[PDB]
Amino acid sequence: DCHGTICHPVNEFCYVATERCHPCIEVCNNQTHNYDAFLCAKECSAYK
């Protein structure tokens, strides 16, 4: 996962499509281009 990198636990998640840390705000805000309800829920929602 993410080549061993540990991402920010609240602000980020390890996106395994890219194996990079990606911002939670982006995936959770339904006004963004990369909003993803499922990934927000799974990877971000409970940590904030």
Numbering used by the authors: 34 to 81
Share the article's original sentences.
The Drosophila tumour necrosis factor (TNF) ligand-receptor system consists of a unique ligand, Eiger (Egr), and two receptors, Grindelwald (Grnd) and Wengen (Wgn), and therefore provides a simple system for exploring the interplay between ligand and receptors, and the requirement for Grnd and Wgn in TNF/Egr-mediated processes. Here, we report the crystallographic structure of the extracellular domain (ECD) of Grnd in complex with Egr, a high-affinity hetero-hexameric assembly reminiscent of human TNF:TNFR complexes. Altogether, our data provide insight into ligand-mediated activation of Grnd and suggest that distinct affinities of TNF ligands for their receptors promote different and non-redundant cellular functions.
To uncover the organizational principles of the Grnd:Egr interaction, we first determined the crystallographic structure of the extracellular portion of Grnd. Therefore, we further trimmed its boundaries by limited proteolysis with trypsin to a shorter fragment, which was assigned by mass spectrometry to Grnd30–81. The proteolytically defined Grnd30–81 readily yielded crystals diffracting to 0.92 Å resolution. The structure was solved by S-SAD, and refined to a Rfree of 0.16 and good stereochemistry. The final model includes residues 34–81 of Grnd, which we will refer to as Grnd-ECD hereon. The C-terminus of the Grnd-CRD folds in a C2 helix-loop-helix module, organized in a nested pattern of disulfide bridges, according to the consensus sequence Cys57-x3-Cys61-x6-x5-Cys73-x3-Cys77 (where x is any given amino acids, and the subscript n indicates the number of residues). Although X2 and C2 modules are common features of TNFRs, Grnd-ECD is the first example of a TNFR fold combining the two together, with the side-chain of Phe46 fitting in between the two. A major finding of our structural characterization is that, in spite of the poor sequence homology, the ECD of Grnd adopts a cysteine-rich domain fold consisting of a X2 β-hairpin followed by a helical C2 module, in a combination that has not been observed in TNFR domains so far. The reciprocal orientation of the Grnd X2-C2 modules resembles that observed in single CRDs of human TNFRs such as TACI, BCMA and Fn14 and the fourth CRD of TNFR1, with the conserved Phe46Grnd side-chain packing between the two.
